Design a binder for this molecule. Structure first.
Ligand SMILES: *[C@@H]1O[C@H](CO)[C@@H](O[C@@H]2O[C@H](CO)[C@@H](O)[C@H](O)[C@H]2NC(C)=O)[C@H](O)[C@H]1NC(C)=O
Ligand SMILES: *[C@@H]1O[C@H](CO)[C@@H](O)[C@H](O)[C@H]1NC(C)=O
Ligand SMILES: *[C@@H]1O[C@H](CO)[C@@H](O)[C@H](O)[C@H]1NC(C)=O
Ligand SMILES: *[C@@H]1O[C@H](CO)[C@@H](O)[C@H](O)[C@H]1NC(C)=O
Ligand SMILES: *[C@@H]1O[C@H](CO)[C@@H](O)[C@H](O)[C@H]1NC(C)=O
Ligand SMILES: *[C@@H]1O[C@H](CO)[C@@H](O)[C@H](O)[C@H]1NC(C)=O
Ligand SMILES: *[C@@H]1O[C@H](CO)[C@@H](O)[C@H](O)[C@H]1NC(C)=O
Ligand SMILES: [Ca+2]
Ligand SMILES: [Ca+2]
Lengths: 177, 533, 533, 177
């Protein structure tokens, strides 16, 4: 595990970063990456939401033992997933997500890079992003394991949390290591 | 001696004094090249980075302006600001020196016992109708000085040269828009060397200019971080004359006029790529009233889709937005037929509308007429005029403005909206007139603080200079923090769609809510629902 | 002992005291017969002169009222005054004593160190929907006394009995109207014997009543000199429910319900001319919403043409006219669906209109909705209600009223218009409500000066009694001279089409101009132009 | 000549009664009668006009030596005339006019009574009557002769004039006898 690591026990937990109102960013492109370790079949690791109203959202979850991502910036829901490799083997794994409007990218450990290039006409901007939620509890699929070096468009949310950031709020069965 | 090294070479700027004993001095760097000359094979081509020099470049006087022709009244009276029309003389003595190689920008830097650290940067995108102008007209020294910010007036390809498209691949227009972005790239990288802060660049403009400002925020070519704030004064991406939707039609008509209407686009482009720049710029392509012949075009790349849609889909990044309108924008619209007794004949009114409708919407007619008649005085010709002018003003400026503010806010962007009710009283503008299109420019540039100028003749009162300061302090504070109230009786509250608080800028600034809520709704709400059956 | 000889015989009236120490006494002559009983072969027939008696007739108590049935809520809530509905109890204890022979009128004479000479006469034409009521409800003693005028409340054939027409010759309706004229003839000839001045008869009424007042001025049967002035309070000949345009349809439906729908009219009339008066009056003929089943009808003689046309053609004599409306006439219209939080659901509003349009006009819909939405607060449910109520109020009362005042003046008649903004605050009418239909009646009858009554329960404040006096003094002055200002801070200026000055009657009377000019125009101007394509 | 008589000399004259504003009457029926004496072929004796704006009007004139009347209450102009008898013989003559909406009546001296019953649909009211003009000068057909006992809906205008009525205004070559 790379640097700051957080442990999610039974009963789940949730680290939430709430962007200060006049600072909820919009983005055409997105760089999301995190290193985990878990023995679950289903669970949501990270989820970014656009202030209530606007629909847009980004989700990093594990469906049937395979890490994947689902998001929506305005058209339909676009998903991309590493269905070959398996990652719920309790061992260390790192996933990297990339978005450029609708077109997206995913990559686990060292497996080949996956590319999703959505259908017809696609929308581009992830409007007014207001919260990053780690723990996938609120979405009803608690996570149990360890997360490290979480990087989202420049934010190393996990350190921020560790360094008691005025905006990060930890609640639940989460512990620092 | 004022010297500064850039990533392209060193340059010398001439220092200047201001006509006031409160305004410090300013170092002007006029004529700075921010891109490769759009000439020969580069005409109708995305701008290129500029070529470097070793020595020291003399940047002490305006470089040639872009190809235009304003003299012979072919200019759309209504679209251009009043000060520009009511003084074509002085204006001509600016754009008299032309050249196809015109991509240059001017930098105004202030000189210091008040603020330490990099100074904010305000880039002014000038604009008339996309066919003429030059940031050389707007001298941002008093602003630069009085505010403690660096001001940059820019020059970009206009007319045919800047926006001609063939509808297809031959020419994808939006050249002047790309020029404006190239200016911003140059700025974001080198304004640092002048003491500027590339993390606080605010692009602002008036009329056609503010339209660019807005279009700029809709293009993906303005990537995150380029510029942080925007001020669109009396101008949007939503107005009828902000975009050209028949770029081919008017391209071929320009082709036909200089002998080139070949059946193949690519040949037609090459054909024009030859003609003397002055031969193309002197033709006479006429657009439907209240529309543009040459200008920004929905190319699918720079301008991805119809501005109006992008706006509704939130297809823009988040910036600090400030925009507004003036009380009597469309002065020129009615000034046309206001009899000696300052009135409007009911038949001229009944006509003006029927006509306005024919051009903007080819029954609503009777609904418009109703909505714009003060029945509690259905016969006063002076009133009949005020409302007839509001018609244009509301539709062409106020409605689109609010439309923008409503969406920009609903999507996270911190927005501030203003209404301008105060102009300089001269003899060129009738007495019954009010703040017309562009009457805010001289107050945003701090002209009053340096007394009448060849450009702005008006004999500024003590109020004008006072109000000029009130305005500048907002604009700059905004450019400084993204809040017209920080840092330097009325707090300009934020604009939200639910309360629509706007600052009524006049001699009695004060926050009101829902500017012209009624008409604004007739245009964004009722008229559509109807033309929807 | 109070005795008076008439051209039909002598009669004795009972004297009465008033609940105030400023109001003198009054001699009441209740039950006076002004025409031959409309019975048997006389039913559905123009009224006849009354038959004389030799002795002395006891005229000391109300004579039976005409055939009606109000109890079982079949009464059009919206059309009837609020005080009438919010108290059906007390009302019933008036019309409980019925009879087909009901053509009688009540005379209220004052008794004297102030004015010498014949006293003016104010004839009050009561009215609800033409189906019920009795001038017996309105006790004009305080008025009679406080003003020094003689007041006459009249009774006339209502419901089927009074306005049933077959569309042809069988029955030409308008019987109740002829009854009202017969009362006026009787008055013009005998009111002299009571000290009355037959040269200063002012007929006034509220709602359905004021509709009669107006129709009376349109019928040639009211010859020059009969009466000289008119006051139409909250009521016209122009409202949707003032006239029945399908007299046959509803006549046959009444026929069918009592077994009589024969193919021949004359037989159908005779058929009904037999049935027990109470059998006809208890049926249940339902008219389209906002319309009447039985009432005045365009017969070509009494009512020569459509009121609206006659009005435009000046087909009326000249009288001194005074008319007006109350702020929230159509309370009952919305009171129907005002949730616990005193609001109106945008879906209930969107509905109420769509429905209102379906009934009054079988697109305008979207125009109405726009016109009646305060966009500077497009979400406040309390506001959404105020405007929804104005919709009805404007259309059903204000617009027709102004329409009338505009023509009556443009044709020489001296007109005065008023808007009533003040009601008595009780617990039966919501707090958010305002002057509803009929809230002016108790102030015109001087009720406040005699404290709460079984009919008008409200606990009148000192203001109510004060304002009651201000109103009575106008009404009477008007009845006296034809000017609300003569003889007895605010001068009720005259209403002219060019300035439309109206007296805003409230706690702060004051003359304003162009009452609700905007909406009034939407209805008399725009809506028509549109439904005209 | 019956009672009050007025003499119109050369240069014509004009006696005008101006109803006080708030008293300009409207009427469905009209009774107009006057006694004259003249040797003219053309001339207008009496004319009642509705306050400027409203069109309605009533006119009593002599056309080609025969007394007649023309009026209009809202539809067309309706005229009725005694074309048989002659009256411009310098001798005394009395004419009586009657109106009831459109239907009208005329009668000279003792000749049979004439009845005009206008065409299609007819209007009825003579709105806001504002002035009675005797002398037919303003209408451009001056009268010269003698007029007596003028009766209009109850107004004996000629006496009124004689008794210096606050509203009657005499101007021109008119003299009392
Ligand atoms: C003139 O008098 C009146 C108008 O004032 C006319 O009224 C009715 O007109 C119809 C249509 O021609 C006749 O059939 C009726 O007999 C008339 N009845 C009334 C109410 O008078 C009348 O017709 C005219 N004179 C007549 C009866 O010849
Ligand atoms: C321009 O550059 C030249 C270099 O030859 C220098 O001598 C001069 O002072 C500079 N400025 C001007 C144009 O005066
Ligand atoms: C240009 O050429 C095309 C090719 O035929 C022609 O259809 C078009 O009308 C021409 N443009 C005009 C309108 O002059
Ligand atoms: C001041 O302005 C006015 C014109 O509006 C006029 O007096 C003159 O042009 C200016 N200067 C003066 C006082 O001459
Ligand atoms: C009604 O008439 C009778 C006749 O006997 C008379 O005695 C009486 O006084 C009159 N009214 C009443 C009940 O006083
Ligand atoms: C009443 O009778 C007439 C003639 O017989 C008929 O036309 C009419 O429809 C009947 N009314 C109804 C519909 O019950
Ligand atoms: C006074 O008015 C109120 C109604 O709001 C109520 O108390 C009653 O009807 C009246 N009389 C009293 C004080 O009981
Ligand atoms: Ca009068
Ligand atoms: Ca008429």
């Amino acid at each position: 595990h790379a640097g700051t690591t957080y442990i999610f026990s039974k009963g789940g937990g949730q680290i939430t970063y709430k962007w200060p109102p006049n600072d909820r960013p919009s983005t055409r492109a997105d760089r999301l990456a995190i290193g985990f370790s878990t023995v679950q079949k289903e669970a949501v690791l990270v989820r970014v939401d656009s202030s209530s109203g606007l629909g847009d959202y980004l989700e990093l979850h594990i469906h049937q033992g395979k890490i994947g991502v689902k998001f929506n910036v305005g058209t339909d829901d676009i998903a991309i997933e590493e269905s070959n490799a398996i990652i719920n083997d309790g061992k260390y794994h790192v996933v990297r997500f990339t978005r450029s409007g609708g077109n997206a990218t995913l990559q686990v450990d060292s497996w080949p890079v996956i590319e999703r290039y959505p259908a017809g006409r696609q929308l581009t901007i992830f409007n007014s992003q207001a919260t990053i939620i780690i723990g996938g509890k609120e979405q009803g699929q608690p996570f149990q394991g360890q997360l490290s070096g979480l990087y989202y468009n420049g934010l190393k949310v996990l350190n921020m949390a560790a360094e008691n950031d005025a905006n990060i709020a930890i609640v639940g069965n989460v512990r620092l290591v | 001696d004022p010297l500064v090294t850039t990533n392209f070479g060193k340059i010398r700027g001439i220092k200047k004094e201001l006509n006031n004993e409160i305004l410090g001095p300013v170092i002007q760097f006029l004529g700075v090249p921010y891109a490769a000359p759009p000439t020969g094979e580069h005409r109708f081509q995305p701008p290129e980075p500029p070529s470097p020099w070793s020595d020291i470049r003399n940047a002490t006087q305006f470089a040639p302006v872009c190809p235009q022709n304003i003299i012979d009244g072919r200019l759309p009276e209504v679209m251009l600001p009043v000060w520009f029309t009511n003084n074509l003389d002085v204006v001509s003595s600016y754009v008299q020196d032309q050249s196809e190689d015109c991509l240059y920008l001017n930098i105004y830097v202030p000189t210091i016992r008040d603020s330490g650290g990099p100074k904010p940067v305000m880039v002014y995108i000038h604009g008339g109708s996309y066919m003429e102008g030059t940031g050389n007209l707007y001298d941002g020294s008093v602003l630069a000085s009085y505010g403690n910010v660096i001001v940059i007036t820019v020059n970009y390809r206009l007319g045919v040269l800047g926006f001609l498209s063939t509808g297809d691949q031959a020419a994808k227009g939006n050249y002047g828009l790309l020029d404006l972005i190239q200016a911003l790239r140059w700025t974001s990288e080198n304004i640092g060397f002048f003491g500027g802060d590339p993390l606080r660049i605010t692009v602002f403009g008036s009329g056609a200019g503010g339209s660019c400002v807005n279009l700029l925020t809709l293009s993906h070519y303005s990537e995150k971080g380029l510029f942080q704030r925007a001020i669109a004064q009396s101008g949007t991406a939503l107005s009828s004359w902000a975009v050209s939707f028949q770029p081919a039609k008017y391209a071929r008509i320009l082709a036909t006029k200089v002998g080139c209407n070949v059946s193949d686009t690519v040949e037609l482009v090459e054909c024009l790529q030859k003609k003397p720049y002055k031969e193309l710029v002197d033709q006479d392509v006429q657009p439907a009233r209240y529309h543009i012949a040459f200008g920004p075009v929905i190319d699918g790349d720079v301008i991805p889709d119809d501005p109006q849609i992008l706006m509704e889909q939130g297809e823009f990044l988040n910036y600090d937005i400030m925009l507004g309108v003036n009380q009597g924008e469309g002065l020129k619209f009615v000034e046309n037929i206001v009899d000696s007794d300052d009135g409007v004949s009911a038949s001229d009114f009944d006509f003006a509308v029927s006509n306005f409708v024919d051009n903007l919407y080819g029954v609503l007619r009777e609904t418009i007429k109703f909505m714009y008649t003060d029945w509690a005085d259905r016969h006063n010709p002076e009133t009949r005029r005020k409302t007839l002018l509001a018609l244009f003003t509301d539709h062409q400026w106020v409605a689109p403005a609010v439309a923008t503010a409503d969406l920009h806010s609903n999507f996270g962007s911190p927005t501030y909206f203003y209404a301008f009710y105060h102009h300089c009283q001269t003899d060129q503008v009738p007495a019954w007139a009010d703040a017309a299109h562009g009457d805010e420019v001289p107050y945003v540039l701090g002209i009053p603080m340096i007394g009448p100028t060849e450009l702005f003749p008006c004999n500024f009162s003590k109020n004008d200079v006072m109000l000029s300061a009130v305005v500048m302090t907002y604009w700059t504070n905004f450019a400084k923090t993204g809040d017209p109230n920080q840092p330097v009786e009325v707090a300009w509250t934020r604009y939200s769609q639910k309360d629509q608080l706007y600052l009524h800028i006049g001699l009695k600034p004060r926050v009101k809510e829902h500017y012209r809520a009624n008409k604004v709704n007739l245009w964004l709400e009722l008229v559509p629902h109807l033309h929807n059956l």
